[PDB]
Amino acid sequence: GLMQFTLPVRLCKEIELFHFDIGPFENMWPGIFVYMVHRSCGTSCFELEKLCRFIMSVKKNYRRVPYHNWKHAVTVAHCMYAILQNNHTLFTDLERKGLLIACLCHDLDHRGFSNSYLQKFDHPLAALYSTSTMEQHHFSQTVSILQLEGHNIFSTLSSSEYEQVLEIIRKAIIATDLALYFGNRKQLEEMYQTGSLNLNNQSHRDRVIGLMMTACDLCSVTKLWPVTKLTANDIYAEFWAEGDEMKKLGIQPIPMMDRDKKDEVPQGQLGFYNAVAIPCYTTLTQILPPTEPLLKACRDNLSQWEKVIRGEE
Numbered sequence: 001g002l003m004q005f006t007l008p009v010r011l012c013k014e015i016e017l018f019h020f021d022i023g024p025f026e027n028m029w030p031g032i033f034v035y036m037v038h039r040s041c042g043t044s045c046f047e048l049e050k051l052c053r054f055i056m057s058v059k060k061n062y063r064r065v066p067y068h069n070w071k072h073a074v075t076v077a078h079c080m081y082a083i084l085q086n087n088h089t090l091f092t093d094l095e096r097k098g099l100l101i102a103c104l105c106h107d108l109d110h111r112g113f114s115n116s117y118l119q120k121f122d123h124p125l126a127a128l129y130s131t132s133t134m135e136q137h138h139f140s141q142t143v144s145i146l147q148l149e150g151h152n153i154f155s156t157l158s159s160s161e162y163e164q165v166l167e168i169i170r171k172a173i174i175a176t177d178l179a180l181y182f183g184n185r186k187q188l189e190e191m192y193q194t195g196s197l198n199l200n201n202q203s204h205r206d207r208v209i210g211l212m213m214t215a216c217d218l219c220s221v222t223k224l225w226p227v228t229k230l231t232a233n234d235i236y237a238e239f240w241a242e243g244d245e246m247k248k249l250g251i252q253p254i255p256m257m258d259r260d261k262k263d264e265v266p267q268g269q270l271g272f273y274n275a276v277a278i279p280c281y282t283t284l285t286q287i288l289p290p291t292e293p294l295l296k297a298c299r300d301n302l303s304q305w306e307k308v309i310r311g312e313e
């Protein structure tokens with residue numbers, strides 16, 4: 001337990017900043033996550049042997065898809081770490097524990113296909129889970145992995161704390177369903193503006209955690225431009241294959257997933273930054289001022305997308 005995980009100097013410093021990229025060395029991503037848990041939560045929050053075994057079963061259960069893979073899991077967990085570390089005093093011991101795990105597990109056993117495509121294919125998961133289809137499956141997958149022998153990192157929690165953390169994680173993971181984002185941010189905006197927002201109201205905490213989850217999930221848009229751009233290529237690798245699969249079912253895909261509408265990528269990013277990303281980080285900055293660097297980074301990458309369109313790159 002006197003076994004403080006460390007990183008090389010450049011990582012030890014940059015990991016603290018919102019725009020840290022976890023880099024291309026797959027084998028360093030568990031260490032980076034353990035570092036983040038130990039700093040965010042303590043060396044005491046999880047039995048190391050159980051946490052490492054959990055991490056490795058989570059990793060095994062992410063597929064080798066272009067975007068919705070283990071690198072995304074660990075990237076989304078890093079963003080949550082940076083929030084939790086810039087707003088240390090706002091969050092319960094159970095929230096700091098649960099949310100880092102929520103993020104790591106939030107896309108477990110993703111197949112590189114949208115809730116839409118599952119429903120149009122008529123996949124058994126769309127019959128088991130009518131809305132937030134993949135999101136309910138990811139939560140299901142997380143509980144299953146916690147139920148494996150030697151995997152229950154929540155072992156030491158009381159019957160109460162255990163049901164609380166699983167409930168934080170369940171709401172956390174459901175909130176990553178972007179179809180639910182729009183409603184949640186409208187409600188948080190109005191509540192903030194009418195001065196009615198109350199972090200003592202569990203229902204309100206839930207909504208705020210929901211926005212954090214969206215903000216971590218979308219955090220490719222707050223990175224250095226070359227990360228933002230090279231992640232977008234991975235994103236279109238999934239979207240276009242899905243469009244191909246839609247076409248095989250006899251269905252015109254939406255332009256966002258039609259590789260024949262490549263030419264319009266810059267404009268679609270602009271719409272997304274305006275419709276989702278900018279409002280998401282704007283509202284998050286309002287409620288959690290120290291998350292301002294996410295908003296500014298997003299605005300910078302909006303501006304790089306504008307430059308693409310103007311053929312200045």
Ligand SMILES: CCOc1ccccc1-c1ccc(-c2nc3ccc(F)cc3c(N[C@H](C)C(=O)O)c2C#N)cc1
Pocket residue numbers: 178218220221232235255256257261262264265266267268269270271272273
């Ligand atoms: C949804 C999650 O995706 C992400 C996550 C992170 C960063 C970025 C993304 C991401 C992925 C794709 C887009 C996108 N690409 C297109 C490419 C061509 C095209 F014709 C249309 C679109 C397009 N449609 C615009 C919006 C419309 O017509 O409403 C969109 C949209 N939205 C924008 C952002």
Ligand SMILES: [Cl-]
Pocket residue numbers: 111
């Ligand atoms: Cl598959």
Ligand SMILES: [Mg+2]
Pocket residue numbers: 106107134176
């Ligand atoms: Mg997801």
Ligand SMILES: [Zn+2]
Pocket residue numbers: 072076106107176217
């Ligand atoms: Zn995700």
